[PDB]
Design a protein around this ligand. Sequence first.
Ligand SMILES: [Mg+2]
Lengths: 213, 229, 100, 36
Amino acid sequence: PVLTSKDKITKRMIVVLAMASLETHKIKYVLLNCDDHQGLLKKMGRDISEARPDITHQCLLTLLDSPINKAGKLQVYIQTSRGILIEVNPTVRIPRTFKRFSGLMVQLLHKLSIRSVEKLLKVIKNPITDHLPTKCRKVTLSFDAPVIRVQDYIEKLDDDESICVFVGAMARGKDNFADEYVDEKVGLSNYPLSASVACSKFCHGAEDAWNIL
Amino acid sequence: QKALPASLVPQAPPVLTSKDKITKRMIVVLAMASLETHKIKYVLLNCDDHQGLLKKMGRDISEARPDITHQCLLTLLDSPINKAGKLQVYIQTSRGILIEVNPTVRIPRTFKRFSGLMVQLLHKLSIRSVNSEEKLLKVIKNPITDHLPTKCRKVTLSFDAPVIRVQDYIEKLDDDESICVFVGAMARGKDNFADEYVDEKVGLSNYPLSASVACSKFCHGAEDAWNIL
Amino acid sequence: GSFQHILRLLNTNVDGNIKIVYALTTIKGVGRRYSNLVCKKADVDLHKRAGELTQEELERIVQIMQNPTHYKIPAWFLNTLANNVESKLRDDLERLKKIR
Amino acid sequence: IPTHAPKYEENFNPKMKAQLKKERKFTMKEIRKDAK
RNA sequence: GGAAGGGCACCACCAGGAGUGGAGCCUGCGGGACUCAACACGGGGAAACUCACCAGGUCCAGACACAAUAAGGAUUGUUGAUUUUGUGGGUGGUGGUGCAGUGAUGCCCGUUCUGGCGCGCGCUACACUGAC
RNA sequence: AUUGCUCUUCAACGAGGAAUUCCUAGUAAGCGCAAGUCAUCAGCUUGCGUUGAUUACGUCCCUGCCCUUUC
Ligand SMILES: [Mg+2]
């Protein structure tokens, strides 16, 4: 069965893409990009470094294309830096190209939902916690945190439990976005990790831990 | 219980190069990269941005997607194994052009700047660093075989091939040897492009895998197997 | 004393491991032959590297370079229109176009 | 491992004095054809 | 049309050596799918769809409380307590938009000027079989 | 302006992709010297001389072109 926020009992891998830099600007509304709109964002006063929705597209691509999504054991939540929280239906097949991804995001943010004929992409009311499973463990990706084997971590946790991973799609910033909800922060690899690799890094171990294959 | 070595300070591992063949290393070949340039200024041909032009060339625009190579390079380049200096990348273009990627490079994350780098590389045949000390991207002479290590195992990613465990596979292989993977960056096509070079083809899973996911999934196996962390 | 691995001469960093002539050539305005002559006037043996140089040798070299004529360095030895042409070319081109 | 950024041009062109010389060659050739 | 028997060819096989194509110089000839339901799909110069867009120069940032100065004069472009000096001090608010003029209303968050190549030759290098 | 010399300045280039052209003995390749003698040529044409190789010198198997059957 397709996993949804309504169902809380089933064990699953939750991945929260915190600090997602998705924003629509009309001159028609178009997703702001670091490269497409440099002069405009200079007028807005925001630095172009933190104007990159490409990272979220890359993280979504690897996560949705990851095995566990195919096995029906993964759901993705995206928290926009502006404060917009987005749920991603596991069944979706997001556009592989970024330009078509940008056009999808602007449709989502304005229409608040995407219907093709269960919302594929649905904007939902904060906080994240109410949507998350009732019994679930929360962790963040921290470089400074101790390095832990993702596989060995998952087995030592319970079976009824689910796991939430809060990954920062931000280009640069302090790793305190999800400190308020999380109970402990862990390190995944010894070297610095990009958000996409960390999501790819994490999901493979759960596949090994849960024998998704 | 043991006295520490003379020097514990961590030093950067050597940057693997085609000249060196002895060291055990990871080789990933992004075979069948769809990278083509055409004067409109030269632009890397894209499936969506350019549709009428490739129709004039007579090439199927389904096989006109360089971003698949971009994401595979991105996920492959940023993998910790590259940070450990145990992985070195080759790209075989659909045209037959072989491109050597130095592990030190940092390709742009956005596709638009990535396209600009390919067209510069394909025309100038090489890319120089900002500090001007090494050629990060260089076109090299085919076949791939001469560049590869003297003792090395060759495998491809085949959906139809038996499903294997990457971690168990790498452990059972010898140490002095190396391992080559030939990944199909094509959106859809038959998996015989590396048949002449490879000796046996392996499947990483039953369900279909994306090219980037398979590269990311495979390399995690080496890092766990080799304790790269 | 200790060999000088690097030296500062005329506001330029010169490596000790290079010979005196081919080290002094690094200085702007100093080539191979000019450095050779400066050394020969300074009465410095050319076989020595730059690091073996004593302070007096370096100071004498400085005064050779700064006062060449005072030390008998030979005088012979020591050291819009384009746009108009473009416009004329354009006039030529347009007239020739009018012919054809 | 060390990381070095690649150097490239945003738009590739395959200074003006060379451009001036290039036009001369075309003008030299074009005139000679007309004379012939 | 077929068949048979022979010969020949660095425009054939075979074995190698030289080049050209990378760099510098010189020079001849010619000028409509969708690993991508939803989006994106006839487009081309960063941006600019008809008064736009891009880059710069002016004007706008006075709530209120207290105290002082102060009518024999604080401040104004000649005026008269509007300000000025010091201490404290709140607010996105000529906001917009969707709903049922009205509503503790859901949602979000400026002004005037000045400029705008394709095909080919030849020579030299990338050193210690070398350079001087 | 012209052609030489002196000094200084000191770049790209670390053997070159897909491909492609030529070549069997005084031959490939390297080096210079002379004359510009009605076409062509001006660091280009021609001539002259000096040093001097590797490999093959066999086949119609692939390709191509022929000969004979006054079959
Ligand atoms: Mg013969």
